[PDB]
Amino acid sequence: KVSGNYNYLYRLFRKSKLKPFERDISTEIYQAGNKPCNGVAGFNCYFPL
Amino acid sequence: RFASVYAWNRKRISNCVADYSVLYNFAPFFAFKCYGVSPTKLNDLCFTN
Numbered sequence: 001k002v003s004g005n006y007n008y009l010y011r012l013f014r015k016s017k018l019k020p021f022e023r024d025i026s027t028e029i030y031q032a033g034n035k036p037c038n039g040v041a042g043f044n045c046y047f048p049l
Numbered sequence: 050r051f052a053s054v055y056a057w058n059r060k061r062i063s064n065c066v067a068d069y070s071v072l073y074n075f076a077p078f079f080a081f082k083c084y085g086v087s088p089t090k091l092n093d094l095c096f097t098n
């Protein structure tokens with residue numbers, strides 16, 4: 001797309017390794033750090049996709 | 050003595066230990082948009098310069 005093809009996404013954040021032939025469809029928040037993010041998705045909490 | 054946008058001073062850093070954790074205690078970091086490289090993994094990926 002000349003403007004942008006925002007139809008593909010890929011994960012950067014995972015808790016651990018991914019064993020072969022399985023999927024991780026998950027719209028969650030990656031809770032890094034000490035702050036208990038409750039869906040705020042603020043600092044140190046980034047959207048994995 | 051932070052420089053302006055028009056004239057920036059480039060620092061060639063080729064000998065140190067890039068601990069990107071002390072920067073977390075520098076500011077609340079309102080603007081922390083990062084590119085393809087994952088912010089949570091920077092110590093594992095070594096950079097030429």
Ligand SMILES: *[C@@H]1O[C@H](CO)[C@@H](O)[C@H](O)[C@H]1NC(C)=O
Nearest residue numbers: 015022023024025026027028
């Ligand atoms: C896989 O199972 C683990 C443990 O039950 C769970 O924490 C994780 O969210 C699951 N992931 C998916 C994609 O089902």
